[PDB]
A = this chain, B = another copy of it.
């Protein structure tokens, strides 16, 4: 399981999700859980055929009052033999 720390940001009517370690995995969702579901897929997209960067330790981050961290597991769906 490949996990990265996401910053969830309250935009009032939706949640913005970004990964400092994986900038191309930026997404959003109407609720925290939908945003999290989306974030798992966004990580898979962004890390396709890429080397995997280290995960940052979020304890060193300075966050806004609108922001909190969720660890997101990268989606990894396989359909063929040997999954």
Q: Which residues of A contact B (CB under 8 A)?
A: 8, 11, 13-14, 24-34, 36-38, 41-42, 44-49, 58-59, 63, 68-71, 73, 75, 77-79
A-B contact pairs, 26 of them (CB 8 A): A13-B79, A14-B59, A24-B70, A25-B70, A27-B68, A27-B69, A27-B70, A28-B69, A29-B68, A30-B79, A31-B44, A31-B77, A31-B78, A31-B79, A32-B41, A32-B44, A32-B77, A33-B44, A33-B45, A33-B47, A36-B48, A37-B49, A37-B68, A38-B69, A42-B68, A45-B70
CB-CB < 8 A to A33: which residues of B?
Answer: 44-45, 47-48
* Residues of chain B lying within 8 A (CB to CB) of residue A14: 59
